[PDB]
Each structure stands twice: as C-alpha cells, then as structure tokens.
Amino acid sequence: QTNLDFLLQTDPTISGMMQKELQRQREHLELIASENFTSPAVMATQGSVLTNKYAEGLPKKRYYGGCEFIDEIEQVAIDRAKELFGAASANVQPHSGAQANFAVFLTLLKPGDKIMGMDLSHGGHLTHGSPANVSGKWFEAVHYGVSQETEQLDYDHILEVARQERPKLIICGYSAYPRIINFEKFRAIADEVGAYLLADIAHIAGLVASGHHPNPVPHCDVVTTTTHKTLRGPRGGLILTRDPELGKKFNKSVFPGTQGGPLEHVIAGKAVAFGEALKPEFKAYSGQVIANAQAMAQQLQNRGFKIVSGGTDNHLMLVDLRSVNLTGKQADQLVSDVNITANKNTVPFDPESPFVTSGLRLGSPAMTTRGLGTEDFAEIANIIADRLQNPEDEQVKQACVQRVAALCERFPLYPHLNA
Amino acid sequence: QTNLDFLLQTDPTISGMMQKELQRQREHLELIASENFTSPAVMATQGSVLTNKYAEGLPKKRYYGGCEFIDEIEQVAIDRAKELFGAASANVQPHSGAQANFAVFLTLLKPGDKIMGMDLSHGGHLTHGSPANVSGKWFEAVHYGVSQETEQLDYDHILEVARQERPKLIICGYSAYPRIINFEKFRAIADEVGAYLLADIAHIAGLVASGHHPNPVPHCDVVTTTTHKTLRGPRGGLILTRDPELGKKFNKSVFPGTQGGPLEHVIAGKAVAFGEALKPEFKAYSGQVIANAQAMAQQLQNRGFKIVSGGTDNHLMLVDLRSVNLTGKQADQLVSDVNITANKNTVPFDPESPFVTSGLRLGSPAMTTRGLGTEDFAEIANIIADRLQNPEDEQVKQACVQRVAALCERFPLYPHLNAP
Numbered sequence: 001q002t003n004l005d006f007l008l009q010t011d012p013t014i015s016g017m018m019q020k021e022l023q024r025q026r027e028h029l030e031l032i033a034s035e036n037f038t039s040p041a042v043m044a045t046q047g048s049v050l051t052n053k054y055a056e057g058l059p060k061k062r063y064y065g066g067c068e069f070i071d072e073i074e075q076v077a078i079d080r081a082k083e084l085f086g087a088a089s090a091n092v093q094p095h096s097g098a099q100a101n102f103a104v105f106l107t108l109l110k111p112g113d114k115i116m117g118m119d120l121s122h123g124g125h126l127t128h129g130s131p132a133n134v135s136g137k138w139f140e141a142v143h144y145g146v147s148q149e150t151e152q153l154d155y156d157h158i159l160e161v162a163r164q165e166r167p168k169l170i171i172c173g174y175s176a177y178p179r180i181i182n183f184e185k186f187r188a189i190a191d192e193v194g195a196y197l198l199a200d201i202a203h204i205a206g207l208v209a210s211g212h213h214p215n216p217v218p219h220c221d222v223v224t225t226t227t228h229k230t231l232r233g234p235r236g237g238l239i240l241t242r243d244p245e246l247g248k249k250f251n252k253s254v255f256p257g258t259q260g261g262p263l264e265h266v267i268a269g270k271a272v273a274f275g276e277a278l279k280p281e282f283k284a285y286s287g288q289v290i291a292n293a294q295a296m297a298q299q300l301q302n303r304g305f306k307i308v309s310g311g312t313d314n315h316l317m318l319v320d321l322r323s324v325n326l327t328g329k330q331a332d333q334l335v336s337d338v339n340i341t342a343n344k345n346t347v348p349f350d351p352e353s354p355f356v357t358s359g360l361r362l363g364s365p366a367m368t369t370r371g372l373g374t375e376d377f378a379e380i381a382n383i384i385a386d387r388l389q390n391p392e393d394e395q396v397k398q399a400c401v402q403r404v405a406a407l408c409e410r411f412p413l414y415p416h417l418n419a
Numbered sequence: 420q421t422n423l424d425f426l427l428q429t430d431p432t433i434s435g436m437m438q439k440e441l442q443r444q445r446e447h448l449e450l451i452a453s454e455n456f457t458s459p460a461v462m463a464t465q466g467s468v469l470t471n472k473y474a475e476g477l478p479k480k481r482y483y484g485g486c487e488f489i490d491e492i493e494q495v496a497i498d499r500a501k502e503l504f505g506a507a508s509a510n511v512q513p514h515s516g517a518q519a520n521f522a523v524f525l526t527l528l529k530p531g532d533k534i535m536g537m538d539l540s541h542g543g544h545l546t547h548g549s550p551a552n553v554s555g556k557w558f559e560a561v562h563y564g565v566s567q568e569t570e571q572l573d574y575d576h577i578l579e580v581a582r583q584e585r586p587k588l589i590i591c592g593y594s595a596y597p598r599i600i601n602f603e604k605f606r607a608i609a610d611e612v613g614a615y616l617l618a619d620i621a622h623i624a625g626l627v628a629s630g631h632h633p634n635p636v637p638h639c640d641v642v643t644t645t646t647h648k649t650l651r652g653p654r655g656g657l658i659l660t661r662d663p664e665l666g667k668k669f670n671k672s673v674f675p676g677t678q679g680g681p682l683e684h685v686i687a688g689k690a691v692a693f694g695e696a697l698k699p700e701f702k703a704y705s706g707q708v709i710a711n712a713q714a715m716a717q718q719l720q721n722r723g724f725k726i727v728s729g730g731t732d733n734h735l736m737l738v739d740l741r742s743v744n745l746t747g748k749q750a751d752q753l754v755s756d757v758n759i760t761a762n763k764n765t766v767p768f769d770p771e772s773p774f775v776t777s778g779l780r781l782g783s784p785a786m787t788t789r790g791l792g793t794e795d796f797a798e799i800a801n802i803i804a805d806r807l808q809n810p811e812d813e814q815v816k817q818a819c820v821q822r823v824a825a826l827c828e829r830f831p832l833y834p835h836l837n838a839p
C-alpha cells in the first residue's frame with residue numbers, strides 16, 4: 001500500500017481533484033513564465049516523513065533534539081547552493097521568495113528607510129516596494145522604470161534617480177524583464193550613492209546557475225531567489241551572499257527573525273534540485289530554455305505581434321497586444337479557451353489598469369522541461385497567433401485545440417504517475 | 420517506477436539520509452511536544468504535482484491562469500477549516516505559524532505600536548514579542564508571565580498589567596503552557612483596555628478542534644495556528660476569525676501583504692488534515708492525547724520529579740529541574756542517550772541561560788498517534804525517571820534502551836513504507 005492509496009481511500013474528494021490537476025498539467029501548454037515541472041525526485045522529498053521534524057536553528061545548532069539526519073540534509077543543501085552559485089554563504093530555510101526578501105529587509109533596514117526598486121507596472125516585484133505589500137507599507141518606496149524608447153533599463157537614468165532619491169537599498173532582479181541585467185552597473189550605482197544592493201533573481205536563477213546570465217553574487221551585497229522558477233526546484237526561497245559575516249546576520253533574520261521551523265522536506269527537495277542543476281544536462285536545458293523563448297518571440301513577431309523591448313535574452317517575454325486590439329485579460333481568456341495557460345501582465349507605460357492590462361506574459365521553462373525544441377515553440381507561437389487573430393472563428397479554435405493536443409501527446413509529462 | 424525510485428537513482432545521498440530519518444522516527448520515542456506523525460494521505464498531497472502551480476490571489480480571484488483545480492482544493496481547505504473551528508473566515512495560505520502571525524500584525528498594527536504577550540521564558544512564543552524576532556524589534560513588546568505561587572496565569576494580574584501598559588494588541592496562546600486558557604477572561608481584559616485580541620493556538624489547535632479545550636474563535640478578534648502540532652497536519656499556518664470583514668483584511672495581509680505564491684500541495688494537505696479532524700476518531704485521539712500526557716506527568720511526579728504548575732490539562736508538560744542537579748540541556752542529552760527525543764526548555768523563573776535551561780519539555784501527540792495508551796505513557800515516565808536518577812548507570816541505560824525498543828516495536832510507524 002502507498003501513501004497515494006491512503007489518500008484515495010480516506011479523502012476521495014481531494015484525491016480526485018489532485019488527479020485532475022495532473023491531467024491539467026499534461027493537457028495544457030503551460031506558458032506561465034514563473035512555472036516549471038519539478039522532478040520526480042524533488043516531489044519524493046516533499047512527500048516524505050521529513051515534514052514531521054521540528055528543526056529550529058541551524059545544522060548542529062538546533063533548538064530541538066533528534067535532528068541528526070535533518071542536519072546532514074540541510075548541510076548538503078547549503079553546500080550545494082554555495083557550489084552552484086559560487087557563494088560564500090547560503091541560507092536554505094526561507095519559505096518563499098517573499099520571505100527571503102523580508103529577512104534581507106530585517107537585516108539591512110528599519111521601518112521608514114528608503115528602498116528603490118523597479119516600478120511594479122514595468123516588471124518589478126510586489127516585494128520591492130508595492131503599496132499593498134509590507135515593503136511599501138513600512139518603508140519609503142521609490143521606483144525606477146524602463147526607458148520608453150527601448151523598453152529596457154537605461155543605466156544612466158537609474159543613476160540619476162538614485163542620486164536624487166538617495167535610497168538605503170537598491171533592488172534589481174524582476175518579474176517581467178526580458179533583457180540581461182548588468183549587475184556591475186548596479187554596483188557602480190549603489191557605490192556612488194552609498195546604498196546596499198540586493199539582486200532578487202527569482203525568475204532567472206536557473207540561467208544564472210548555468211552561466212547563461214551574468215552572475216550577481218560577486219557584485220551584490222545579497223542575492224535572493226525562489227527555488228521553483230527557472231531553477232526547477234521545489235517551491236521555496238534561498239538567500240545567498242558573497243560576505244560570510246553578513247550571511248550569519250541573514251541566518252539570524254531568517255530564524256528567529258522572521259520564521260519558526262523550516263520545511264525540512266522542502267529543504268531536501270532544494271538539495272536535490274541544486275544537485276540536478278550542477279549536472280551538465282542542466283546547462284544544456286537552460287540554453288534550450290533561452291533558444292525556445294527566442295523562437296517563440298520571433299515567430300510571434302513574424303505574425304505581427306509586438307514583443308516588449310523587441311525580443312528576449314532570457315526565458316520570458318511580454319506580448320504587447322495593442323496591435324490586435326485586445327487587452328491582456330482578453331488574450332489570456334482567448335488562449336485559455338484553446339488549452340494554453342499563461343497570465344496577463346501590464347506592459348511598460350500601459351494605458352490599461354492592472355486589472356485589465358495590455359500584455360500577455362509567456363515563458364519557455366515548463367514546456368522546455370517536457371522536451372520541446374525551437375520548432376515546437378514556433379508552432380506554439382503560430383497557435384497563439386491563430387487564436388488571437390481569429391477569436392470568433394470556431395474552426396480556428398478547434399484547430400488550435402487539436403494542435404495543443406498534438407504537442408502534449410508528443411511530450412509526455414510524468415508518464416509513470418497515474419498512467 | 421515511483422518518485423522514490425527516481426530519488427534513489429538520481430540522488431542516492433539524499434535518498435539515504437531520508438531513509439535514515441524514517442528509521443529514526445520509527446526507533447525513538449518522539450516526545451517533542453510540537454511534533455506529530457502526519458498521515459500517509461497528507462504526505463501524498465505534499466509529494467504531488469500541486470507544487471508546480473503558481474496561484475497568487477484567492478480561489479476564483481487569481482493572478483495566474485490554470486487554477487481551476489487548485490481553486491477547488493483551496494476552497495475545500497477553507498470550508499473544512501471554517502467548519503472545524505466554527506469560524507466565519509479562514510485563510511489557508513500562511514506558510515507557517517510565524518507567517519500567519521506576521522500577517523495579523525500587518526493588518527492590526529504599525530511599527531512602534533505596543534503589543535503584550537507572555538514572556539518568552541514563561542512560555543510565550545518568539546513571534547509574540549521577542550527582541551530577536553520582528554515582533555519585538557519593530558514593535559514595543561511588553562510581557563506578562565505566570566504566578567510565582569501557582570505557576571499558571573493569574574487573570575487579575577494580567578488585567579493589572581494591561582491597564583498599566585495599554586497595549587494595542589494582546590496575544591494569548593503559548594508554546595509551553597500546560598493549563599487551559601480562559602479566552603473569555605482574555606476578552607474581558609482586552610475590552611477593558613481597548614486592545615485587539617489574538618489567540619495563537621498552534622500547540623492546542625487539535626484539542627480546540629475536538630472540543631477538548633475551550634474555543635477562542637467566538638471571543639478573540641483573530642485566531643492563528645500551525646497546522647502540524649496537535650492538529651496533525653502538514654507543516655504550515657492558518658488564520659481564522661469570527662468577523663468576515665476582518666477576514667477580508669487578513670486575506671489582503673497574507674497576499675499581497677506578506678507572501679507571494681501559496682504552497683498548494685501543502686494546502687491540499689491542510690484540506691486532508693482538516694477532514695481527518697472532523698471525524699469522530701480525531702476526537703477520541705485528542706482525548707487520548709490528554710489522558711496520555713496526564714499519565715506521564717503523574718508518573719513523573721510519583722517518581723519525585725516536578726512538573727511546572729503541578730500537572731497538565733493538555734498534551735504537554737515541563738519537567739522543572741531547578742532543584743535537581745542536572746540542567747535541562749543535560750536532561751535532554753541523557754534521554755537522547757536512551758533513544759528518547761525531546762527538547763530542553765526554559766521554565767518560568769529559570770536561573771539558567773536559554774542555552775542551558777532548567778527544563779525538559781515533553782508531549783504526548785506523536786506517540787499517541789502510534790497507538791500508545793496511558794499505561795504506556797506511565798512506562799515512558801518510568802524510563803525517563805530511571806535514566807535521569809541514574810545518569811552514569813550502564814545497566815539502567817541498557818534496560819531503558821530495551822524498554823524504548825519494546826514500545827517502538829509494539830507500535831510501528833508507517834509500516835507500509837519500504838526502502839526503494
């Protein structure tokens with residue numbers, strides 16, 4: 001008898017909904033740029049008895065008895081993180097990217113200090129100073145955005161904003177930014193104004209780890225990330241720093257500063273994900289992720305769609321829909337009708353509200369994990385274009401549904417589960 | 420081929436360590452009061468593909484596409500939590516008890532406001548105002564403690580402290596308090612001074628759910644909890660309230676106020692655990708948890724040990740070593756030497772450093788889940804007392820080891836789990 005058997009027997013309601021989610025993942029193009037398909041080995045750790053252990057503290061320095069094997073696992077996670085990112089220090093306990101960022105704020109700032117991040121509507125994250133988040137509620141948040149002429153960062157402009165605002169912390173790393181970030185220029189800016197510098201590399205962490213994006217670790221005071229976007233791990237957070245003394249302060253801000261017990265089953269999954277990312281295959285995967293995103297962006301452009309900034313150098317893109325006279329909300333609905341899963345997103349300088357938007361955010365990591373290549377991503381672009389150009393045409397609709405089904409059949413997902 | 424097979428094949432290092440942890444859980448008396456053994460069904464949800472879904476927002480009100488099935492699961496979790504605790508609102512997204520508490524603080528307080536909680540050394544939690552936690556760093560946290568005479572709360576004294584300090588938020592619910600909490604009296608106190616009232620029922624949530632401890636939901640502005648202590652769920656948090664308008668504000672403080680994406684695999688596990696807690700067997704389990712803790716406390720007292728407050732009304736106890744020639748750190752080590760897992764713990768009025776302590780915290784939930792009864796808990800007390808009374812005696816040590824092994828063999832843990 002298996003744990004899944006017990007679930008079916010004791011809670012058929014939840015068992016059936018979970019099986020429907022597996023089928024959903026199998027039968028949609030999962031183009032949400034922040035999603036991935038984590039490995040069977042990672043899922044095994046998350047389904048383990050490690051959930052039962054209280055392990056407040058750090059390896060060998062715990063507030064609870066019984067942590068001998070949890071300590072071995074968490075130290076492997078730390079050591080593999082330091083290896084994978086070339087970092088002198090790593091804390092693998094943050095529950096999420098948001099909680100990683102907050103522990104950094106607790107270390108470096110006090111309430112009322114000034115933080116500078118990218119405007120939420122230009123691709124910054126809610127935890128980088130949004131009024132609805134603690135970062136904008138308890139701190140003075142100021143913003144920079146992208147240039148209207150390029151739709152990407154203008155570093156001289158960022159320097160001028162920094163000089164005018166004199167923030168205590170500058171944040172770089174974003175949620176919808178398709179170009180390479182120059183961490184050396186951010187360090188030059190931070191040094192000129194005397195600010196701390198955080199890189200939140202959540203989206204791009206797998207590309208950083210594999211050498212397909214510049215590395216912030218030697219340049220920034222601290223690097224935070226999720227483990228679950230391009231890094232393809234379990235859902236959670238991570239704090240890295242080049243300064244090992246500062247890293248000890250970040251440890252104290254994770255626990256007891258902001259969290260209680262760590263999720264040790266998730267931390268075992270982090271160890272597994274970092275081990276996978278250290279293999280040559282992960283570098284090839286990350287290169288394919290970028291090639292696939294570029295193939296999709298280019299074919300969307302061939303079909304008449306505007307890509308914000310004119311292309312991408314990473315795994316994601318924003319489609320600016322003002323051309324096909326659709327909002328992002330409308331386009332997201334229209335692609336969902338043909339079994340394509342994405343999310344709407346404001347574009348820089350968007351005339352629509354954040355509840356409507358002019359953009360659709362698409363990314364390649366999840367379908368690249370399923371094995372799709374560049375020609376398959378050009379086919380995805382053509383399905384999207386066909387649907388959005390002919391939203392009333394039922395025969396185009398069915399052709400799109402069928403072409404999605406063919407892609408899903410060609411590239412099975414977790415075929416050993418509930419076959 | 421299973422996910423566990425993939426783990427053994429691709430990461431034998433982690434696979435082996437994880438196996439060792441299963442064996443460790445099987446072969447020790449797990450007396451950590453805040454631990455439990457969650458069910459196979461809960462573990463199945465946590466090991467599922469639900470980890471792949473981004474689901475910021477709320478059911479039917481998401482910022483990501485594709486949430487149709489996640490929305491059904493999270494709404495089942497919400498609905499079962501509301502039924503289980505009699506709450507008008509529930510948010511099942513907090514990643515932990517600490518994060519549930521922080522979302523409450525973000526809703527009710529601004530930095531610099533005054534909060535009042537139990538002193539850490541008297542069993543309050545770090546998130547209730549410790550200066551090492553955001554709660555005491557960015558808020559002015561004042562404290563109350565237990566009576567020196569009874570070693571439990573004196574509600575008239577708490578009232579006097581509240582009248583003098585005029586806190587904006589009073590926090591009740593604790594990490595090492597063995598007696599029933601009177602939430603009606605805490606409400607009377609909060610009302611006298613105009614404070615909000617939070618109950619953090621992390622430790623006792625399963626006893627509340629089963630009717631074996633008074634329910635704070637009708638009396639407090641908000642109730643937070645962990646899902647993984649006496650509630651026996653996956654590791655995570657939960658916010659409950661009697662006031663649905665406050666509930667809407669707590670939702671916004673969880674997301675986008677405090678967190679990003681929720682852990683929907685864990686939330687499916689919360690749904691499963693709440694469904695288990697709604698069944699009559701859970702009520703019987705919770706009554707056994709208390710009877711077992713009481714039996715262990717009573718037999719420790721029969722052996723000459725002191726229990727803070729003179730006994731327990733719930734699942735936990737502190738052995739008070741202030742008058743014994745061992746520290747809490749040593750007592751924890753000595754029981755670990757005979758395969759008993761606990762934690763050292765500060766006692767009220769402890770003369771010792773928090774790195775040393777004069778207490779040992781013990782609880783019944785995890786071994787009650789394995790099937791032990793009151794006579795078995797009396798036996799646990801006698802094993803502990805034998806070891807602590809004779810710390811250097813090697814024959815007693817080996818007898819203790821054998822007696823622990825006998826209990827572990829008689830009451831197996833997850834017997835269906837094999838090696839890959």
Ligand code: NA
Nearest residue numbers: 136137139140
């Ligand atoms: Na502000």
Ligand code: NA
Nearest residue numbers: 740743745746
């Ligand atoms: Na002592």
